[PDB]
């Protein structure tokens, strides 16, 4: 379904693991009161 | 291996390949065993 | 001349100078082991493996 790769940040340690793969869950939650119709499959099928 | 899979997928969606072998492979020898010991990455067997 | 067994100050200052590949001058004794290394955990783990074996 998904496959991704991510670097981490500024550092001085090549073998230290990091959190750059968190960016696979990146979403915006400012305007989160009402539903996105784009998530609902029914809507998406009607458009097709 | 996960980078392999990513490169693999994006090769299929680009429309460059319909099929793709995808994976990874690595051997254990004397000299890597030693160098991972000097990084203190591997379990010291005498402590164990 | 007289006899003085080595200071723990001279012997601690040499095993941090030798490991970091520097002279005695370049390293101040007032600076920490974590400061002198920078951000390298491997070099900081390797200096506290010398002083654990030495003293
Ligand atoms: P530094 O804080 O980069 O740590 C290096 C070690 C070897 C401890 C780390 O990469 C590990 N193998 O857990």
UniProtKB/Swiss-Prot annotation, chain B:
Q: Which domain of life is it from?
A: Eukaryota
Reproduce the UniProt comment on modification after translation: 4'-phosphopantetheine is transferred from CoA to a specific serine of the Acyl carrier domain by the C-terminal PPT domain. This modification is essential for activity because fatty acids are bound in thioester linkage to the sulfhydryl of the prosthetic group.
What does the function comment of this entry state? Answer: Fatty acid synthetase catalyzes the formation of long-chain fatty acids from acetyl-CoA, malonyl-CoA and NADPH. The alpha subunit contains domains for: acyl carrier protein, 3-oxoacyl-[acyl-carrier-protein] reductase, and 3-oxoacyl-[acyl-carrier-protein] synthase. This subunit coordinates the binding of the six beta subunits to the enzyme complex.
Similarity section: Belongs to the thiolase-like superfamily. Fungal fatty acid synthetase subunit alpha family.
What more does the entry say? Present with 17000 molecules/cell in log phase SD medium.
Q: How does it assemble?
A: [Alpha(6)beta(6)] hexamers of two multifunctional subunits (alpha and beta).
Record's protein name: Fatty acid synthase subunit alpha
Q: Which gene encodes it?
A: FAS2
Q: Which residues of the full protein are shown?
A: 1308 to 1355 of 1887
Swiss-Prot record, chain C:
Q: Which domain of life is it from?
A: Eukaryota
Its transmembrane ranges are: none
Q: Which residues carry this modification: O-(pantetheine 4'-phosphoryl)serine?
A: 41
- Give the free-text PTM comment from the record: 4'-phosphopantetheine is transferred from CoA to a specific serine of the Acyl carrier domain by the C-terminal PPT domain. This modification is essential for activity because fatty acids are bound in thioester linkage to the sulfhydryl of the prosthetic group.
Tell me the ranges covered by the Carrier domain, including all copies.
6-55
How does it associate, per the subunit comment? [Alpha(6)beta(6)] hexamers of two multifunctional subunits (alpha and beta).
Function field: Fatty acid synthetase catalyzes the formation of long-chain fatty acids from acetyl-CoA, malonyl-CoA and NADPH. The alpha subunit contains domains for: acyl carrier protein, 3-oxoacyl-[acyl-carrier-protein] reductase, and 3-oxoacyl-[acyl-carrier-protein] synthase. This subunit coordinates the binding of the six beta subunits to the enzyme complex.
Q: What does the sequence similarity comment in the record state about its family?
A: Belongs to the thiolase-like superfamily. Fungal fatty acid synthetase subunit alpha family.
Q: What else is known?
A: Present with 17000 molecules/cell in log phase SD medium.
Name assigned to this protein: Fatty acid synthase subunit alpha
- Name the species this protein comes from: Saccharomyces cerevisiae (strain ATCC 204508 / S288c) (Baker's yeast)
Q: What is the lineage of its organism?
A: Eukaryota, Fungi, Dikarya, Ascomycota, Saccharomycotina
């Amino acid at each position: 379904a998904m496959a991704a790769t991510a670097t981490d940040k500024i550092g001085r340690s090549v073998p230290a693991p990091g959190k750059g793969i968190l960016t696979t869950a990146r979403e915006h939650h400012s305007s989160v009161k009402y539903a996105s119709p784009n998530l609902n499959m029914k809507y998406r099928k009607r458009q097709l | 291996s996960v980078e392999s899979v990513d490169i693999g997928v994006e090769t299929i969606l680009s429309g460059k390949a319909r099929i793709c072998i995808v994976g990874g492979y690595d051997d254990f020898q004397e000299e890597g065993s030693f160098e991972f010991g000097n990084m203190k990455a591997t379990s010291n067997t005498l402590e164990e | 001349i007289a006899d003085e067994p080595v200071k723990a100050s001279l012997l601690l200052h040499v095993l941090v100078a030798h490991k970091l590949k520097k002279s005695l001058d370049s390293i101040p004794m007032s600076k920490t082991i974590k400061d002198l290394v920078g951000g390298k955990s491997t070099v900081q783990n390797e200096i506290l493996g010398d002083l654990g074996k030495e003293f």
